[PDB]
Design an enzyme around this catalytic site. Structure first.
Site, PDB file in Angstrom:
ATOM      1  N   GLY A  30       0.779  -1.218   0.000  1.00 56.28           N
ATOM      2  CA  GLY A  30       0.000   0.000   0.000  1.00 56.28           C
ATOM      3  C   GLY A  30       0.815   1.274   0.000  1.00 56.28           C
ATOM      4  CB  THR A  31      -0.420   4.805  -0.165  1.00 58.38           C
ATOM      5  OG1 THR A  31      -0.591   5.196  -1.532  1.00 58.38           O
ATOM      6  CG2 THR A  31      -0.096   6.026   0.701  1.00 58.38           C
ATOM      7  CB  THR A  32       4.710   5.561   1.943  1.00 52.62           C
ATOM      8  OG1 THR A  32       5.412   6.064   3.086  1.00 52.62           O
ATOM      9  CG2 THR A  32       4.702   6.596   0.845  1.00 52.62           C
ATOM     10  CD  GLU A  47       3.064   7.322  -2.134  1.00 49.34           C
ATOM     11  OE1 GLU A  47       3.745   7.334  -3.183  1.00 49.34           O
ATOM     12  OE2 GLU A  47       3.085   6.375  -1.322  1.00 49.34           O
ATOM     13  CB  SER A  75      -0.109   1.728   4.494  1.00 50.02           C
ATOM     14  OG  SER A  75       0.382   3.038   4.688  1.00 50.02           O
TER      15      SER A  75
END
Ligand SMILES: */C1=C\C(=O)NCC/C=C/[C@H](NC(=O)[C@@H](NC(=O)N[C@H](C(=O)O)C(C)C)C(C)C)C(=O)N[C@H]1C(C)C
Ligand SMILES: */C1=C\C(=O)NCC/C=C/[C@H](NC(=O)[C@@H](NC(=O)N[C@H](C(=O)O)C(C)C)C(C)C)C(=O)N[C@H]1C(C)C
Lengths: 244, 233, 244, 250, 196, 243, 222, 204
Positions: A30-32, A47, A75
């Site tokens: 996943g996104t940070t 993010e 995330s």
């Protein structure tokens, strides 16, 4: 034998729970997102990948508030993340209703922890596909936390999870060393935006949108709020500058 | 590999994937293309209806959920009925109890959470349908894209279904233009029909084959079919 | 979830057989033999104690003959534990009938009930069947002396002479050879001991390995009497019949 | 969540065997030896306290348990299973008997109750049989003294004397020789200690052995006076000291 | 029954008579109406003995568990648990309770929870049948931040008048002092407070 | 057939693999702990390893206060550790409320052991991968140490150790007792008993400790508390001025 | 009914009368109002007789199981808490008014419970209809630090106050002494001040006096 | 109104020398209307006897209940229940219906087969056990019965004497109660034998 990774509550021969470990894989993908504990509050940043110009800018808020003083960012599988927050809101509400005082962050952390740990006890459920950074200000100051799909969680000075969790951790550890006397909410906001920009390299493919929120005794009066407008752009600039 | 981790939704694959959700997600791609786009005054849905024989009818793709909200489906028709009915109740509840029109952003959050419940608990199956939701509320015109995984997103426009990538590129290209078609519904609808046609292949859009819906400022969500859409072909 | 470990104890084979019922029977076939012989003036129950020892207390022991009513008793072949569960529900059923109608429960009515209970574990519940087979010996004023049999399947039938447990084929053949409609209780008593004596896997048919019971209409009264022989009574009858 | 295990975990194999029960029995075999001996005026039950660490305090753990003031139990197999079984057994003696008739249940009946509990864990949904075998010894007015054995299957039988666990085969043989229907309690206690000796490897004293008996009534152990018909418990656990004094005339 | 709680400079003091009745019979003359729900959070019970005891016993349980999980509970929180119980069960309870606690940051606090199940934070509070006779007296003699000595006096005087006029009150006067210094139990006999 | 290794049912050998694997998980933390009994106090020492710089060291612990008198140290993953602590706390509060007196260390241990025993017999419940050591100065039994495992087993100890190097600590302690001949540390003050505890931990493990390498809990008559980094340091300096 | 409880320097003693009634009719002239919860924890009960017996045995049963479970001697505070919470659960519908006492690892104790669930603690207590007569005696003769014998006298005197002055009380005096060190000693019919005088005549009828219509033997053998 | 006064009837038990006796009337009416003079109120399970006054429907019901319970008791215990035990069973059975009791006045009489000691006990409608050593009375004429017994009774009467005494207590008490009478029956119980006699009394 084998196949100790097909059912959730199962212990492998070396004492592990693969289903939970596989969940972590969904998280890492996943996104940070991060969390920085300043000296009178906490800052949350994340993010937001621009999968397309078609996404209305600013319109798909990720960070969530629990009660009026707690912030949560995660995330991994977003839907799982929301599910956990809904539980958190219920838990916070139940607590306040009986004890009157809004739930202390440390108490809230265990509420989430026990709940998540619960999803690793039966094969009739799946573990949470998210790691969550959360915290706020209470009767004893600021508290930052990160919860793993295993139900494990601890208090942090700085925390990061997701695709660029390494860049982030590197950057966060640096801050810790260059600020033994603490960091201000205003400074954490700036620094946070930067940490997100750097950690965006391990995903430099798609363009992103930054999101920051904070809970500071002196800046927001212990309440959780989103950083927007001038203070936001200002942080974007400070980050866009040091990224060059 | 995969074969050992796709027997249900309560199992993660060694790489963190949820195959049952992914298979459900596939049912959508196999469905008939539908488009959604919006200006600042209106939101429009355009869908290609599909039939069985020529002796059959064309299955409806658009459903009204309230006077200010509605959607178009791609995938399992039944599931769309279930979900849209749930969305009707939520709209209804918001009015009865709070005398408040359910915000589109909120409707989205509700759908997401409802979907998510059938992806973490044994016995349930994910929904096999994609939904495009448009509505006009207190913050204006909106467009949402709902996926059975629970991921709901707000966009200016989009498309889902077979050959959908066609229209989606067109919109992603037309963006700056249609998002400004304010105070002119017929123009937004035309932009919508031009978008969807980019996903055609078999035939061309006819009268009992095209379906369009619109909602806006002083426009209660309404569906157009047959001769009603003739003026756009 | 759980489905993975479900044996599915209640399903048909491609031949249309009930696996568990079949296997349960398979288990019964290794149980101490039990024989029921019905005469004109009484019924006889005989069973061979499986597993015995010098130290096994026998005056206190019971493992095959249980009194259900004052006019009904059963001989057990299979899992004693399972049998007791059923036996107790049976004793209760008889008392209920008595309370409702102020009349002793007709023998077949009691048997059909027990058989029905079993039949159930065959069609629903996901549980295993009772590994038990009963030989019922009872008396009522509608059909006089009766002898019945029920097994894991939940089916029951009437008999003049019958055996359950191990070596039934052998036992059945021998009974089919010397049973005669006009038999008298003592006649039956002997035929019973003889059959066992011939099917026994042991060296000799000693009393310490037997359980015996008779339902005879003690002429000097006009009523029916149930009698479970004691160690010595079996030891005696064992000498007279000529097995010493 | 919610226990979806509503089906049997113990079923019939094509051969007619009930695996889980067989395996449970196996677990019992691996267990530490325990035995029982019935005399004409008492019963004795004993086992070895296999302390699992020199730092553990074996007294804080009893394998010989009082169920009612005239009934005790001992086992072989899984200690934790036995423990919960003892609690259930003590409770059932109340809820299913004393609370109805105002008197403690006679040995055979309480045993019958315990047996049932075990039978159920052999057929109920989502569980495994108990990994233990018990030796219940007690006394009731109309049945005198008795000794019983209860297996994981739920089956039980009365004994003059017997042993279970590791050296049961050997112990049983040594008992078949020494037993007779004229033994006085003290004799059984002696035979007991002798039988147990063989099955014990190293230390053998009042601290590594656990033995209790069902014998005369102990008014001294009642705790109060004034009620004639209440003469005291028949169950008594020997003390480390009492055991050693006996081992001296062993 | 006469019970009161007064907040003063160093903390808070709880006071009560010791008479429990059933009609005109004094079932107990040495009753202790000052109940402990935590180290420095106590309460004064009035109304049904059975009800107030059951309620107190439960609050104590809730605060003990609360402590195990989230450390020390505030005085406010304790008043909240009482209130929750008294309000939600208003139809089957007859409990007039006063909650008093001392904490290092707030000195002493006093919350009165009347028959309805409402909560009222106050400088001091009075309750019980005897309280009606001292409304005037207390209103004309209470001062904020009195000294421990003045407070003990104010309470000894107030309750003596309550005990004087209300037949449901009597016996000894009991007090509990809650300050940073700890917990102190005071007891005053008839001969002493009667002639005040 | 090969599922007798995924759920708590018997294996042909009459074993419960899932229970054995649970034990394996208890060492995941790679932390050891030991408990000793003073003349009238009980002390539990546990290693503390917080290598991450981003962690707030103060929020890391495997020691819990179940009640004013009961203390619990856990060997195993923190989430199961906390699940267990919370239950024990609830079990303790409830017991006091119903029976009118503070729940005894051994009783709480028995209750938790029974709970563990169930996960051993019920198929839908998994054992917890943790070993619980309960300590206190019982009002009837004096200094007490009771430990429970995923097997539902438990017993009282004179002293005890748990973790990857359990054996080293154990034999070290066994020795000290074969020497002293008494079942406890003949020391009046707990500070000295804490020092004894840390000293022998060092001997058996052949390692030196700093104030941030340990975690200490002490149980006295009517109170169980943990030490601060400084309370530890002071205690560590003490052992230093003996060597 | 008159039941009392008195503490003495090293224990506690409880006493009661033995009259049971139904309206103005004596049901039992010698019932026992003293109940054993555990060997050293006894309870005197007033109110609905069936209730004092049942609730008393119920808690007693649970105390027994708890004792076996915890491997400890039962404590009076436990009997007290279990009883009161039970009585409270039943909104006073279980007509039990009890004086519970005994000795345990923590000392000697004396409490009382009321049907609705409230409890008291003291050195001397009384309940029942003779409650007031007994209490007058206690209020007139109790003193701190009494000897085992002094206490028994006082308790026994208080019960008599009831027997003689309360119509709902009568017959004998039952006592139970629970001393901190020894076994509890139950003294059934410690006092029997009400023996019926020898009847003036015997009413033994001359056989054949009663007219019988028919006769027969009953079969008890099966 | 009072359920225990709809049908009427009385029972009374007494202890003699190595014997016990229990008697009852035979009336079963509905208020003033006499309906049956064949309503015996005494029953027995093995060697234990149970008399029951009160509401007829419950008298019948309880008998059917105790038969059920005593039968199962014998099957499991492998012996007939004793007086003392049965008394406990009767008591707990009644208290189980604490807040909606059967309107009956049970009386137990018998001789402990193991001790040969005579035994009698009475119970209120919710189980309160009254175990007397001399006599037990129950029914709508219990006051009269108490008066009769307290005077007529004397310890260790021989069976033949106890019979006169119990019969006179019952007879004269019933004659002062409008709801009792219409015939009586008396059981004299000894270790060996049990005799049953029907008394001749007024039919008004
Ligand atoms: C404080 C006095 C009051 O605030 N109010 C007067 C009512 C008294 C309550 C309490 N005493 C009792 O509850 C006594 N039982 C009782 O009164 N029962 C009623 C009866 O009239 O008999 C029944 C419920 C109809 C008894 C349990 C002590 C009392 O004295 N309150 C005091 C103080 C709080 C102890
Ligand atoms: C102590 C005397 C009292 O404390 N109170 C007077 C009331 C008497 C109670 C008890 N006797 C009974 O309970 C009688 N049964 C009874 O009253 N039953 C009720 C009914 O109205 O019939 C039912 C419960 C509604 C009977 C069992 C004697 C008595 O004598 N109390 C004594 C002492 C505790 C025995």
């Amino acid at each position: 034998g084998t196949g100790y990774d097909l059912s959730n509550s199962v212990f492998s021969p070396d004492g592990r729970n693969f289903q939970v470990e596989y969940a972590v894989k969904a998280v890492e993908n996943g996104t940070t997102s991060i969390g920085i504990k300043c000296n009178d509050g906490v800052v949350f940043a994340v993010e937001k990948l621009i999968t397309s110009k078609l996404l209305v800018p600013q319109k798909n808020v990720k960070i969530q508030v629990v009660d009026r003083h707690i912030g949560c960012v995660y995330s991994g599988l977003i839907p799982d993340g929301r599910h956990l927050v809904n539980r958190g809101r219920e838990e916070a509400a139940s607590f306040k209703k009986l004890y009157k005082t809004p739930i202390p962050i440390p108490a809230f952390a265990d509420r989430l922890g026990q709940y998540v740990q619960a999803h690793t006890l039966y094969n009739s459920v799946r573990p949470f596909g998210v790691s969550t950074i959360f915290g706020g200000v209470d009767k004893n100051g600021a508290h930052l936390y990160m919860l793993e799909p295993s139900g494990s969680y601890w208090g942090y000075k700085g925390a990061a999870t997701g695709k660029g969790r390494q860049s982030a951790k590197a950057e966060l550890e640096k801050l810790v060393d260059h600020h033994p006397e603490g960091l201000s909410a205003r400074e954490a906001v700036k620094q946070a935006a930067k940490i997100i920009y750097l950690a965006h390299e391990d995903n430099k493919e798609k363009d992103f949108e930054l999101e920051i929120s904070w809970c500071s005794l002196s800046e927001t009066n212990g309440l959780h709020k989103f950083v927007k407008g001038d203070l936001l752009q200002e942080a974007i600039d400070f980050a866009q500058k040091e990224i060059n | 590999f995969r074969n050992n981790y796709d027997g249900d939704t309560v199992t993660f694959s060694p790489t963190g994937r949820l195959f049952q959700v992914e298979y459900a997600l596939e049912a959508i791609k196999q469905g008939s293309v539908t488009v959604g786009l919006r200006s600042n005054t209106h939101a429009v849905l355009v869908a290609l209806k599909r039939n069985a024989d020529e002796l059959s009818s064309y299955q409806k793709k658009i459903i009204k959920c309230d006077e200010h909200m509605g959607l178009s489906l791609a995938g399992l028709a039944p599931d769309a009925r279930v979900l849209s009915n749930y969305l009707r109740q939520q709209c209804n509840y918001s009015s009865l109890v709070f005398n408040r029109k359910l915000a589109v952003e909120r409707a989205g959050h509700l759908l997401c959470d409802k979907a998510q419940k059938n992806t973490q608990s044994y016995g349930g199956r994910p929904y096999g349908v994609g939904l495009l939701i448009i509505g006009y509320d207190k913050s204006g015109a909106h467009l949402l894209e709902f996926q059975p995984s629970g991921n709901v997103t707000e966009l200016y426009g989009t498309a889902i279904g077979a050959r959908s990538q066609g229209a989606k590129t067109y919109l992603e290209r037309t963006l700056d233009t249609f998002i400004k078609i304010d105070g002119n519904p017929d123009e937004l609808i035309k932009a919508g029909v031009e978008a969807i046609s980019q996903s055609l292949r078999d035939e061309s859009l006819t009268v009992d084959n095209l379906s369009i819906a619109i909602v806006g400022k002083d426009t209660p969500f309404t569906i157009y079919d047959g001769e009603a859409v003739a003026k756009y072909i | 979830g759980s489905r993975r470990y479900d044996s599915r104890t209640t399903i048909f084979s491609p031949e249309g057989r009930l696996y568990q019922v079949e296997y349960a029977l398979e288990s019964i076939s290794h149980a101490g033999t039990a024989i029921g012989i019905m005469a004109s003036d009484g019924i006889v129950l005989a069973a061979e104690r499986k597993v015995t020892s010098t130290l096994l207390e026998q005056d206190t022991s019971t493992e095959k003959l249980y009194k259900l009513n004052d006019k009904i008793a059963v001989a057990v072949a299979g899992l004693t534990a399972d049998a007791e569960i059923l036996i107790n529900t049976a004793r209760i059923h008889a008392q209920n009938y008595l309370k409702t109608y102020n009349e002793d429960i007709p023998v077949e009515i009691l048997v059909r009930r027990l058989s029905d209970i079993k039949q159930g574990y065959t069609q629903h519940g996901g549980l295993r069947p009772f590994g038990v087979s009963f030989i019922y010996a009872g008396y009522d004023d509608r059909y006089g002396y009766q002898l019945y049999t029920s097994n894991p399947s939940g089916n029951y039938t009437g008999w003049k002479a019958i055996s359950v447990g191990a070596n039934t084929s052998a036992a059945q053949t021998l009974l089919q050879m010397d049973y005669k409609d006009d038999m008298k209780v003592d006649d039956a008593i002997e035929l019973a001991l003889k059959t066992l004596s011939k099917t026994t896997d042991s060296s000799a048919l000693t009393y310490d390995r037997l359980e015996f019971a008779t339902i005879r209409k003690g002429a000097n009264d006009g009523e029916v009497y149930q009698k479970i022989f004691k160690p010595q009574e079996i030891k005696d009858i064992l000498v007279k019949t000529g097995i010493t | 969540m919610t226990d979806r295990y509503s089906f049997s975990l113990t079923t019939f194999s094509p051969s007619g065997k009930l695996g889980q029960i067989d395996y449970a029995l196996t677990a019992v075999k691996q267990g530490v030896t325990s035995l029982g001996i019935k005399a004409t005026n008492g019963v004795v039950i004993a086992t070895e306290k296999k302390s699992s660490s020199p730092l553990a305090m074996s007294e804080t753990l009893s394998k010989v348990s009082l169920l009612t003031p005239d009934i005790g139990a001992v086992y072989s197999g899984m200690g934790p299973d036995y423990r919960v079984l003892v609690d259930k057994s003590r409770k059932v003696a109340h809820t299913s008997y004393k609370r109805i008739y105002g008197e403690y249940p006679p040995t055979k009946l309480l045993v019958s109750e315990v047996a049932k509990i075990m039978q159920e864990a052999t057929q109920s949904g989502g569980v495994r049989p108990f990994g233990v075998s018990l030796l219940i010894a007690g006394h009731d007015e109309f049945n005198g003294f008795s000794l019983y054995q209860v297996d994981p299957s739920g089956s039980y039988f009365p004994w003059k004397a017997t042993a279970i666990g590791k050296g049961s085969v050997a112990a049983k043989t040594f008992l078949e020789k020494r037993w007779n229907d004229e033994l006085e309690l003290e004799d059984a206690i002696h035979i007991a200690l002798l039988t147990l000796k063989e099955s014990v490897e190293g230390e053998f004293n009042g601290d590594t052995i656990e033995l209790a008996i069902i014998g005369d009534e102990n008014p001294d152990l009642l705790g109060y006076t004034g009620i004639p018909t209440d003469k005291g418990p028949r169950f008594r656990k020997l003390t480390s000291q009492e055991i050693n004094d006996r081992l001296e005339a062993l | 029954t006469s019970i009161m709680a007064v907040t003063f400079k160093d903390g808070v003091i709880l006071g009560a008579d010791s008479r429990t009745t059933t009609g005109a019979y004094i079932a107990n003359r040495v009753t202790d109406k000052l109940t402990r729900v935590h180290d420095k959070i106590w309460c004064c019970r009035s109304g049904s003995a059975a009800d107030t005891q059951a309620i107190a016993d439960i609050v104590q349980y809730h605060l003990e568990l609360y402590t195990s999980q989230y450390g020390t509970p505030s005085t406010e929180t304790a008043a909240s648990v009482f209130k929750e119980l008294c309000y939600e069960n208003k139809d089957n309870l007859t409990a007039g309770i006063i909650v008093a606690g001392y904490d290092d940051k707030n000195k002493g606090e006093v919350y009165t929870i009347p028959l309805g199940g409402s909560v009222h934070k106050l400088p001091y509070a009075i309750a019980g049948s005897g309280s009606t006779f001292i409304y005037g007296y207390c209103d004309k003699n209470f001062r904020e931040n009195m000294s421990k000595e003045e407070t003990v006096d104010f309470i000894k005087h107030s309750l003596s008048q309550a005990i004087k006029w209300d037949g449901s009150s009597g016996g000894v006067i009991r007090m509990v002092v809650l300050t940073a210094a700890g917990v102190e139990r005071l007891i005053f006999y008839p001969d002493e407070y009667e002639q005040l | 057939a090969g599922y007798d290794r995924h759920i708590t049912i018997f294996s042909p050998e009459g074993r419960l693999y899932q229970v054995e694997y649970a034990f394996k998980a208890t060492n995941q933390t790679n932390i050891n702990s030991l408990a000793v009994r003073g003349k009238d106090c009980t002390v539990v020492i546990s290693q503390k390893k917080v290598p991450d710089k981003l962690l707030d060291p103060t929020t890391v612990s495997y020691i819990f206060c179940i009640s004013r008198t009961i203390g619990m140290v856990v060997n195993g993953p923190i989430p199961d550790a906390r699940n267990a602590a919370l239950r024990a706390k609830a079990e303790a509060a409830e017991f006091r409320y119903k029976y009118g007196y503070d729940m005894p260390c051994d009783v709480l241990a028995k209750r938790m052991a029974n709970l563990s025993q169930i996960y051993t017999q019920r198929a839908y419940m998994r054992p917890l991968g943790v070993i619980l050591t309960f300590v206190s100065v019982d009002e009837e039994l004096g200094p007490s140490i009771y430990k429970t495992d995923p097997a539902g087993y438990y017993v009282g100890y004179k002293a005890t150790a748990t973790g990857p190097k359990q054996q080293e600590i154990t034999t070290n302690l066994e020795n000290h007792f074969k020497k002293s001949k008494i079942d406890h540390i003949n020391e009046e003050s707990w500070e000295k008993v804490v020092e004894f505890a840390i000293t022998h931990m060092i001997d058996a493990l052949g390692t030196e400790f700093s104030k941030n390498d340990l975690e200490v809990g002490v149980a006295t008559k009517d109170k169980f508390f943990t030490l601060s980094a400084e309370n530890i340091e002071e205690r560590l300096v003490a052992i230093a001025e003996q060597d | 009914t008159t039941i009392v409880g008195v503490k003495f320097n090293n224990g506690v003693v409880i006493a009661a009368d033995t009259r049971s009634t139904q309206g103005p009719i004596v049901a039992d002239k010698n019932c026992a109002k003293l109940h054993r919860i555990s060997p050293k924890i006894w309870c005197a009960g007033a109110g609905t007789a069936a209730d004092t017996e049942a609730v008393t045995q119920l808690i007693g049963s649970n105390i027994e199981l708890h004792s076996l479970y915890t491997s400890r001697e039962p404590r009076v505070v436990s009997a007290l808490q279990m009883l009161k919470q039970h009585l409270f659960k039943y909104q006073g519908h279980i007509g039990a008014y009890l004086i519970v006492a005994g000795v345990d690892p923590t000392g000697s104790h004396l409490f009382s419970i009321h049907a609705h669930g409230s409890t008291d603690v003291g050195y001397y207590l009384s309940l029942g209809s003779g409650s007031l007569a007994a209490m007058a005696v206690l209020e007139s003769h109790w003193k701190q630090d009494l000897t085992k014998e002094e206490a028994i006298k006082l308790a026994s005197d208080a019960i008599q106050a009831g027997i003689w002055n309360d119509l709902g009380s009568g017959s004998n005096v039952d006592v139970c002494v629970m001393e901190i060190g020894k076994d509890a000693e139950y003294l059934r019919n410690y006092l029997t001040p009400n023996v019926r005088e020898e009847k003036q005549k015997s009413y033994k009828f001359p056989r054949g006096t009663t007219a019988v219509l028919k006769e027969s033997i009953v079969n008890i053998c099966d | 109104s009072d359920p225990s006064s709809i049908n009427g009837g009385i029972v009374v038990a007494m202890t003699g020398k190595d014997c016990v006796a229990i008697a009852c009337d035979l009336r079963l009416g509905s208020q003033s209307l006499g309906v049956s003079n064949k309503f015996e109120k005494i029953f027995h399970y093995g060697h234990v006897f149970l008399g029951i006054t009160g509401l007829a429907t419950d008298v019948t019901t309880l008998n059917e209940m105790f038969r059920y319970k005593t039968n199962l008791y014998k099957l499991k215990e492998e012996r007939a229940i004793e007086p003392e035990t049965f008394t406990q069973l009767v008591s707990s059975s009644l208290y189980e219906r604490r807040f909606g009791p059967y309107f009956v006045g049970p009386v137990v009489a018998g001789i402990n087969s193991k001790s040969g000691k005579p035994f009698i006990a009475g119970f209120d409608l919710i189980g309160c056990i009254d175990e007397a050593k001399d006599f037990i009375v129950s029914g709508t004429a219990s006051d009269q019965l108490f008066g009769m017994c307290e005077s007529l009774y004397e310890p260790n009467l021989e069976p033949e004497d106890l019979f006169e005494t119990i019969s006179q207590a019952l007879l004269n008490a019933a004659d002062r109660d409008a709801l009792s009478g219409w015939g009586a029956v008396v059981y004299i119980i000894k270790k060996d034998e049990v005799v049953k006699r029907y008394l001749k009394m007024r039919q008004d």
